[PDB]
Every structure is written in structure tokens, then in C-alpha cells.
Design a binder for this molecule. Structure first.
Ligand SMILES: Nc1ncnc2c1ncn2[C@@H]1O[C@H](COP(=O)(O)OP(=O)(O)NP(=O)(O)O)[C@@H](O)[C@H]1O
Ligand SMILES: Nc1ncnc2c1ncn2[C@@H]1O[C@H](COP(=O)(O)OP(=O)(O)NP(=O)(O)O)[C@@H](O)[C@H]1O
Ligand SMILES: O=C(C[C@H]1NCCC[C@@H]1O)Cn1cnc2cc(Br)c(Cl)cc2c1=O
Ligand SMILES: O=C(C[C@H]1NCCC[C@@H]1O)Cn1cnc2cc(Br)c(Cl)cc2c1=O
Ligand SMILES: [Mg+2]
Ligand SMILES: [Mg+2]
Lengths: 486, 478
């Protein structure tokens, strides 16, 4: 088992190979659904634990609402173009249901229908809820393991506040928790930003977003969402509270979500030609121990040594595996565990046993270092930190190198052709969005190739005071990130 | 609000009132589906964190398998929900929502298991399933959708598998007893009540005194090679000989929450084992003057700090809209284990008043020691709840030798322990005759308990008169 396609040459097939052979997923006889094996789900558990800790600090309470929602309830607020993606239960056994029932594609209509019962006065606020659940969307866009799946795991938070300031504050708090969840657990850098009027969630006042970029195929991917919903849903669902004068006021809402797409983003960011590369924080085993016998008499000495090292790491709660299987060569094992993304390999040969040393090898850059057994615990600890740092830094470099700043449309296509995004001064007129889509599609016929507004970044470079929009020529308001996406 | 029906007098309405007014659930416009509000879901998270910790000591690895299973792979029948449409178009073939995941997982087990080095395979899922139940649903107890976990393992032999079966069963015991303060009885299902694909089903049974109802609390099966043969799950042993795997499966649902409520709830509302209550303590201030307000606020906050510094989550109810009485009632209703009242008189003593939820005992405590006496109290409450429940379980069993004795016992809201021949045949006979004489009156074999009383040398079966093999538990259920 080896990775047959190179990441830069054939990214799609490299991806499918990596995720199957590293034992993250199995494919399934229902298109767009994938089995999450222990190695994948472990990553989900880690980020889940982190995120739970941090939102409980914000006093968000977990909850669980039904998987099913009635047609009447799901469809109450007009359509507001999701309808072909709804999966419908039409019967139980061989008996038709009087009315069909939908599986949740998200929980707005389920939760907000009961919010008025729970919110009567200003004394009931804020209301802060989260769910860890599964949803179903029958994606017609190309399904891709983790990135776009028809059933996926995720978290949805919904809150309601007495005013705008408090809700918006929470929207950005959540957003930085997403930043930390990418950075600290997946070693993935993201760009924070505000979605254009064309790209935001229809029900939202504004949509803030974390964007990632896969440099290897030049594609941006939305990494997480955090919305200021204002009073839009409060009006739709009649969610009001009597204020301190017993005057009825609309709540100010937020919602926010992040999915197993994250695992996908992480795989694509750090994976190399040898396979999966895991940040230590989301790998079950931090270290693999591999014995080496240069045709040596005593297997048992080396075995006992290896065992000692394993006990040292395990006792320090650094989980590890000792691969003592007789039926595979050391080289086989090196490759096998590289493919599975074990952050550190420790090799023990006969020479090492004589010197009370061992050889430590980093998954990320393949650097080796002979070190004394009695120092392995401190070395390992530090190395697991270094690895994370390295991964993050490398990813950040690629991210920063993927942003070409431009001032006129004339520079754009070149940039797109080099698998980059563009940062451009933009008038933000809603009409220009589809225009820019159409033109970049058309011009891509020569080189979907359309580029779209990814986000208005929080980190704006200086805007020269007479600067014009790259596209319309009108006055430019802010810098916007554009690029091709998933 | 308060509880309008008494537990002993009208159990159903009491239960409905308690779950809604203590803010555990909201009813929903699809029958048998219930919203889990933060207080119920918190309970679920606690027992989940515990179970995860323990199965992870057994090298069980969590995973997630799809909600959907194809018609082919799936093939009880009318209980499955079918998705047949996306938007306005029909799926070319209908897909089911999982009622359980045996066919989803065991289909892929052959690919993952090649040799004894791949064994044991130990997987768990925290997920949801849907079963379209015929019976009227009961919040937590029997719901159309429920959360649960499913564990599935495959071992190289019978011995290892069976040992895992009972390790898991004990973990369920601890789930109920150390976290929900509910006593259970370990037993083995009769040959008609067991899981069909199983070699044997082990089970934990609970009982509700007040309505005389037995509830299956959790399951742990030895599956032997049944599924290994039907699904072709084989491993190369250490001599390169192919052998069938020996499998196990086990599960426990949000029903456990129900079992706890019913067990500990009283006529003031919810009663919670301290470890599954978000707030262990509510601190309530008591005023006379506007002058007192500051000194009592500070003091209160001080207590708060102490508790929270010792990782004891608590709520200071400094609301002015409400009287201390209303507060007491409100937080008792929501099942907070401890109430610390702080008044002026207490303030002059550097003391306060601590009040227990389970038995309403009050006592004065000096600020300096509040921490230590709260910790102890939280232990004591759990213990008291468990012990009391245990008594009520023990007094719920009536040992009989002939069917002559059964019926009075049943009608006293009891279950019977009887010597039985374990003839599958006798199982529906007994049920047809027990109800002849919104829930059924029939009684069924609950479990053949692991702790067997001695069987007198030639004792006859309480029903068929044939020789008795073992002592079995019989009773009414949901
Ligand atoms: N099918 C999917 N599988 C996995 N993750 C998804 C899927 N659809 C959306 N997400 C992610 O879920 C988060 C919440 O997304 P949401 O607001 O529901 O996205 P959306 O409106 O559907 N945008 P789109 O990706 O174009 O479908 C986003 O950060 C997406 O990255
Ligand atoms: N509808 C339900 N809601 C909640 N818990 C349930 C439900 N059905 C079964 N359980 C519990 O889930 C656990 C696993 O049992 P399982 O084998 O899945 O069902 P079961 O034994 O067939 N129960 P039943 O269908 O009522 O005869 C047991 O503790 C059951 O009591
Ligand atoms: O799901 C959303 C908005 C937000 N819901 C809570 C978590 C964070 C998330 O961004 C946008 N969205 C995305 N896909 C959908 C698909 C269908 Br089908 C429906 Cl009915 C509705 C939707 C839908 O509302
Ligand atoms: O669900 C089971 C057996 C075990 N599955 C894994 C966890 C523990 C549990 O006891 C029994 N069971 C109960 N109800 C079912 C309903 C339907 Br519909 C189907 Cl198809 C199958 C079943 C079914 O197999
Ligand atoms: Mg979408
Ligand atoms: Mg059933």
C-alpha cells in the first residue's frame, strides 16, 4: 500500500487514495455518504471537546432537537433555493405517511418555532443554544469526502440577545473559536472576513466567515460560518421580548456552524506524497516504535527495550504504538505508519540498544536525530510541539503566498491561472458579483472557472483615497478577496 | 408553576408535568419525538463522558457510520422509516434510516479483519436512530427517535468476547448507579425475549415502584459466530487457518434519563443526582431592608467564588423580580441538589443555611467551612438517593413457587421471582393468562438474574410443573 498519485500532479486521485489508505474513511453504497473510521472520528472528538469547553465559557448550552421536521414547519417562511436538496421520509415500513416529513438540513425552523415560548421578557436573555448533530442535504454539487457530503456531522449554535452589540460581539467570539480550532488543533490558517451581499446567508444581516485556501489546486473553501441575523428571524418567527418598560422588542439573533469539512481541509493542507500528515493534537498515537534486527540473535532484548520506551511514553500519557509484528520488514512499517500520519517514529536497532539511544524521525520534514533513551520523553514532548508549529507555519506561508493584490481586472486572470486568489478594491455593488463570475468563466474557457467574492477581510490593507473598483471603475469601498472555490 | 398531580396518585400526569415544568423537554409536532432542552441533554453528556472514559480503557474506538442504509443491505419491518424523495424527485431506490447499525457495519467488517493481528476489533458510535413504534410513545422511555450509543466488537474466541460482554454490562451498572443513582439487576434474557441474532442477551433491569413497571435499562449480547457466518467475517489465526470471529454488541439510550426521573422524582418536581445537575448549588439572598442589600450581595458572591474555585458550578440567584420563596420553589422544581440561603441573621454569624433537595434537611454552616460541607453533602445526597431506590427495588420483588401466588403480587405493583423451566413455549401462555386476569396488564420474563438463589433439589416450574432450571424475574413493563 502506497500513494500512487503525486499531490501536485493529480490532486483528486491523491486525495481519495490518502483518505482511504490512511484508514480515515470507507466509501459507501449511497453516493455522497462516507463511513468515518476511528482515525477520522478521533479528530472530530478532539475538536468537539475543545469547542465545547470554549463555548461553555460563553455560557452556551448544548441541546438536542429532532431529526425530523414537518413539511408545514420546514416550508413556512416562503422558500428563501434550497428545496431540491431536502430529503423526504414518505413512509414507515410499507405504509405511506399522510404528509411527508423532512430530515433536517439545518435547525432554524425547528428551534425558532419554540423560541417564542422560551423568551417572554428581557429576563430570559440571552438565550444561547448549541447542537452537536448530523444533517442531510442531497447535494447536487460534486460530493467529496469531508469537504461536501450529503450527510455530515457538525455543530450548530443559535443565540438570541436583547440588542445588536451583544449579538455581534458573540458572532466574532465564535469566529475566533473557529480560528483557534483550525490553528491549534488542525494547524490550519484561515482568513476572517465578511461575505458579500450576494454570498451571505439569505436570513442574515451579515455573514462572517473563515476562509481556507488549498494552494495545490488553487481553490478557496469556506471553513466555518458565523452570522449576525439581526431581527430578521425574530420578525419571521415572531420572537419578541417585553423590555424593561414592558414594550415588546425583537431579539437580535446569531447562528454559527462548523462541520467535518474541517478534517478535509486539514488533510488537504498537510498531506504529502507519502500520505496523511497529522497534527499531534488530533492523532490518537503520537509515536510509533519500530524495532530493527540486523539479523540479530536476541529479538527479546530489543523487544524489551522497545517495551520500556512504550511504557515511558504511555505513563506520561503520550499514547503510542509499538509495532512488534514479525511478518513485516522495518521498511514496510516506516511506510505503513507514515501513510497513517503518525507524527513521530522511534526506530530501535541493535547498535541503539548498545548505546542506550534510539533514532527519532519527524513525519513532517523527515529529519532524524539519534538521542539517548533517558531523554526521549522530554525530546518527544518538545518535538510534538515543534511539529505543530512547523505545520502551521508552512501552511500559513502557502496561504499568504496565494493572495495576489491587484488594482485592475486586467491582472486577475493571470493570478487565477497561477492557482491564486486576488485581493482587489471593490465597490461591492451586488450586480457586479454575477458579472465578475460570468466574465471570469468566459475568459477561463481559454486558459467552473468562475471566480467569486470569498470575503471582505477584517485585515484591510490601506485604501488609497481616490482608488477605483477593479471592475466597475466606480469608487472602491473596501478590499475584497476573490477566487475559484469548492 | 408547581406539580399538580402526586406521584403515588397519578404517575403519568405527574411525569408529564415534571419533565415539562422542570425544563427537561418540549413536546413536538411529530409524535414520539421530543426536544431535549439543556437540562436533559446535560445528563446525557455526563453519562456519555463517563462511558467514553471507561470503554476507552477497553480500547474501544469511537466511529460514525451513515444514517442511511439501502434496501438491499438492510434485508420488525413496519418500524423502519424510508426516505424516498430528494426535493420533488424520487430516489431511484428508497433508503432507510438506521434502526440500528448491524448491517451497515458487519458488511464492512470482512474488509477490515484479515488476521488475528486485526483482533479484537472494537467500535462504538454515539448516534441517533429511528424506530416507528406501534405503541403510544413515552418521553425518554419509548421514543420514535432516540440518542444512544452502539458498541460492536469482534474477538478471536468465545472467552474474550464473553468477558467483554460482562465488563460492558458492569459499566452499564455503574452508568446507572454511580451517575444516575439507580439500582439495576443484571440478568440474562429468556430465549424469546433475547435479540434474535444473539447467542445470549445479558441485560440490566430497573423497576419503578410507584407504577409497578419493569424497564430494560441496557443490553449486552454475546453474538457468537452467527453474524460472522452470515456476513463471512473471518480471520487468519496464528497458524494461517481461517476462523469465524466471535462478536458482541451493546447499547443504552436516553431511556436511562427517564428511568432516573421516575426513580427519584418527588411531588416537588425533579430530583437529580448531583453529578448530572449543571448547578450543584443555588445561592439565594434574603433581604429585609434596602440597607442590607450590599453586605449580603458581597457575602453571596464570596460563597460563589469559593465554590467555583473548587470546580463546583453554582448559580447565585440575585434576581429582584422574585421573592426568596418563589426562588426556593423554582429551583427545587429544576432539581438543584443544594440551596444555600443567606440572610441578615446568618450574616451576623459568618454563617449561612444549607438545604438538601432529596430530604429538605436544613443546617447552619460557617462560611469558613461551606466548601467542605457542600462537597460532603453532594456525596451524601447521591448515596441517600441510591440507597433509597435500592430499598424500593428490593421490596418490589416477591419470591413465589407457583402461579397461584403470582397475580396478587402483580396487583400489588410488584414483580415475581419464580422457578421456571425456560421453555420458550411457556412465554406467551403466561402472558395470555396474566392480562386476561394505556399499558398492558400482562407479565413477561424480564431476566434470569446472574445472582441465583439456591434451587431446592427437585423444585417444579411455577407454570408448567416440569422441573425448574433457574429462578427468573417476571413482571409488567412499558
Ligand atoms: N455538504 C456539506 N458537507 C460538509 N460541510 C458542509 C456542507 N455544506 C456546507 N458545509 C459547511 O458547513 C458550514 C455551514 O455552512 P452553511 O451556511 O450551511 O453553508 P452553505 O450555505 O450550504 N454554503 P455551500 O457550501 O455553498 O453549500 C460551512 O462552513 C460549510 O463549509
Ligand atoms: N423506542 C425506544 N426509546 C428509547 N430506548 C429504547 C427504545 N427501544 C429500545 N430502547 C432501549 O434501547 C436499549 C437497546 O435495546 P434494543 O435491543 O435496541 O431494543 P429492544 O430490546 O428490541 N427493546 P423493544 O423494541 O422495546 O423490545 C434497551 O435499553 C432498550 O430498552
Ligand atoms: O444552514 C444555514 C445557516 C446556518 N444554520 C445554522 C448553522 C450555521 C449555518 O450557516 C444555511 N443553509 C444551508 N443549506 C440549507 C439547505 C436546505 Br435543504 C435548507 Cl431547507 C436550508 C439551508 C440553509 O439554511
Ligand atoms: O438493536 C438491536 C440489537 C443491538 N444493536 C446494537 C446495540 C444494542 C442493541 O441491543 C435489536 N433491535 C431492536 N429493534 C430493531 C428494529 C428494527 Br426496524 C430492525 Cl430492522 C432491527 C432492530 C434490532 O435489531
Ligand atoms: Mg449548500
Ligand atoms: Mg424495537
Amino acid at each position: 500500500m502506497a500513494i500512487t498519485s503525486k499531490k501536485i500532479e493529480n490532486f483528486s486521485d491523491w486525495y481519495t487514495q490518502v483518505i482511504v489508505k490512511s484508514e480515515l474513511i470507507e466509501y459507501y453504497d449511497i453516493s455522497g455518504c462516507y463511513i468515518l473510521r476511528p482515525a477520522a472520528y478521533y479528530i472530530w472528538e478532539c475538536v468537539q471537546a475543545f469547542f465545547n469547553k470554549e463555548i461553555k465559557k460563553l455560557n452556551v448550552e448544548n441541546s438536542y432537537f429532532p431529526l425530523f421536521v414537518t413539511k408545514n414547519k420546514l416550508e413556512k417562511e416562503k422558500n428563501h433555493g434550497f428545496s431540491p436538496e431536502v430529503a423526504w421520509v414518505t413512509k414507515y415500513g410499507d405504509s405511506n405517511l399522510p404528509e411527508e416529513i423532512a430530515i433536517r438540513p439545518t435547525s432554524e425552523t425547528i428551534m425558532y418555532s419554540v423560541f417564542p415560548k422560551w423568551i417572554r421578557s428581557y429576563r430570559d436573555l440571552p438565550l444561547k443554544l448549541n447542537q452537536w448533530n448530523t444533517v442531510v442535504r442531497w447535494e447536487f454539487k460534486q460530493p467529496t469526502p469531508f469537504i461536501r457530503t450529503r450527510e455530515f456531522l457538525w455543530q450548530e449554535g443559535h443565540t438570541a440577545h436583547k440588542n445588536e452589540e451583544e449579538a455581534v460581539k458573540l458572532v466574532f467570539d465564535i469566529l475566533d473559536l473557529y480560528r483557534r480550532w483550525y490553528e491549534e488543533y488542525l494547524a490550519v490558517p484561515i482568513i476572517k472576513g465578511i461575505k458579500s451581499e450576494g454570498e451571505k446567508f439569505g436570513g442574515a444581516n451579515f455573514t462572517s466567515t473563515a476562509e481556507a485556501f488549498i494552494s495545490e489546486n488553487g481553490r478557496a473553501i469556506q471553513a466555518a460560518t458565523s452570522h449576525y441575523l439581526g431581527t430578521n428571524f425574530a420578525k419571521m418567527f415572531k420572537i419578541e421580548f417585553e423590555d424593561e418598560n414592558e414594550v415588546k422588542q425583537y431579539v437580535h439573533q446569531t447562528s454559527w456552524g462548523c462541520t467535518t469539512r474541517s478534517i478535509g481541509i486539514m488533510i488537504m493542507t498537510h498531506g504529502d506524497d507519502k500520505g496523511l500528515v497529522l497534527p499531534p493534537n488530533v492523532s490518537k498515537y503520537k509515536v510509533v516504535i519500530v524495532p530493527i534486527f540486523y539479523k540479530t540473535t536476541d529479538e527479546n532484548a530489543i523487544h524489551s527495550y522497545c517495551k520500556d520506551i512504550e511504557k515511558i511514553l504511555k505513563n506520561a500519557q503520550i499514547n503510542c504504538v509499538y509495532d512488534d509484528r514479525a511478518s513485516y520488514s522495518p521498511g514496510y512499517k516506516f511506510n505503513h505508519w507514515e501513510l497513517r500520519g503518525i507524527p513521530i517514529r522511534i526506530e530501535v536497532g541493535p547498535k541503539d540498544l548498545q548505546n542506550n539511544s534510539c533514532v527519532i524521525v519527524r513525519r513532517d520534514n523527515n529529519e532524524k536525530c539519534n538521542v539517548k533513551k533517558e531523554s526521549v520523553l522530554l525530546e518527544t514532548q518538545q518535538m510534538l510541539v515543534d511539529i505543530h508549529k512547523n505545520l502551521f507555519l508552512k501552511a500559513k506561508k502557502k496561504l499568504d503566498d496565494s493572495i495576489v493584490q491587484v488594482t485592475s481586472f486586467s491582472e486577475v486572470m493571470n493570478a487565477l491561472n497561477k492557482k491564486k486568489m486576488v485581493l482587489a478594491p471593490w465597490c461591492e455593488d451586488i450586480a457586479t458579483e454575477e458579472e465578475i463570475k460570468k466574465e471570469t468563466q468566459r475568459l477561463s474557457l481559454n486558459q467552473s472557472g468562475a471566480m467569486k467574492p470569498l470575503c471582505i477581510p477584517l485585515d484591510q490593507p490601506p485604501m488609497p483615497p481616490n482608488m477605483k473598483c477593479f471592475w466597475s471603475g466606480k469608487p472602491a469601498k473596501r478590499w475584497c478577496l476573490f477566487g475559484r472555490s469548492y
